[PDB]
């Protein structure tokens with residue numbers, strides 16, 4: 243059988259061999275900065291679930307350089323405060339995991355600065371609540387910036403000294419999210435909200451169902467469960483996960499493999515290429531919480547088998563190896579976007595997603 247710890251570490255090595263820039267303490271400067279945050283999350287999570295510390299020095303290097311004032315958003319004053327609330331949220335959650343890994347309060351402090359910064363763009367005066375994604379524009383309240391925020395405040399309610407302010411925020415933010423209409427009639431989440439021209443009212447914009455918008459929300463509800471021990475949060479999460487797993491909604495193929503809506507047309511762009519592994523990692527958080535919350539030994543079995551089915555398909559059909567040479571002895575695995583379709587080329591977002599799936603299985 244497959245060793246998910248072995249393959250996660252081979253995929254991180256492939257990630258580093260092809261995409262890490264030592265001079266920049268970052269992966270692929272030609273790819274979006276927020277996806278370096280996701281990749282960092284994936285490496286941190288590998289180390290947490292497996293018990294290894296073989297990438298801790300590198301992670302520390304990336305954090306030290308990427309927490310500097312960003313050259314494209316100096317008014318954020320660094321600490322990952324960026325020109326979009328979702329970019330900030332990806333790094334904030336990575337600093338929550340770093341804290342979980344190390345116990346070092348410095349990482350939790352960054353997460354707390356990031357929550358206060360994102361909150362600046364929460365308004366109650368449009369859509370009854372939620373935050374904007376686009377800090378310079380203030381035109382779009384979307385699913386992912388609001389899921390990241392919700393998962394951040396819920397995480398802080400379990401970890402921060404002023405825990406009860408964060409719990410109140412997370413409970414409010416979840417009430418808002420649920421009432422927004424982004425969760426649609428099959429319990430899947432569309433891309434965001436549109437605003438009515440004459441009336442100011444907000445409604446589900448019916449833009450695509452992206453896998454990472456079915457995933458970050460599960461981590462948030464898991465943290466809400468841990469903050470309250472109220473199983474209602476796990477029941478909502480399981481309804482959203484069960485909808486992804488259902489072939490009738492088209493995110494799961496007849497072969498059982500998680501499939502981005504853009505794959506069929508070979509049109510997944512640099513953002514969409516990372517989406518699936520973010521879902522996988524969050525589905526593993528939900529599986530762990532469900533199985534822990536009950537005495538049934540089959541509890542969470544369906545999520546565990548789903549992740550395992552996907553891992554076997556991705557390893558068998560989507561994987562490629564770096565050619566070792568007489569000089570560069572580096573060894574790792576490389577991955578394309580489709581967890582079932584063929585390997586044609588690796589990119590850093592595709593690779594980060596692949597590590598996510600393996601770490602979900604550790």
Ligand SMILES: OC[C@H]1O[C@H](O)[C@@H](O)[C@@H](O)[C@@H]1O
Nearest residue numbers: 271273274275276314325329
């Ligand atoms: O948004 C501004 C933009 O400028 C930088 O050069 C990049 O690294 C991006 O990922 C970032 O988002």
Ligand SMILES: OC[C@H]1O[C@H](O)[C@@H](O)[C@@H](O)[C@@H]1O
Nearest residue numbers: 381382383434435436437447
């Ligand atoms: O709600 C519709 C929404 O769709 C786009 O993808 C966004 O970039 C926004 O410009 C707009 O508000």
Ligand SMILES: OC[C@H]1O[C@H](O)[C@@H](O)[C@@H](O)[C@@H]1O
Nearest residue numbers: 384385386433434452513514
């Ligand atoms: O690629 C889809 C992705 O594009 C942009 O980053 C935003 O409109 C997000 O709301 C959306 O999920």
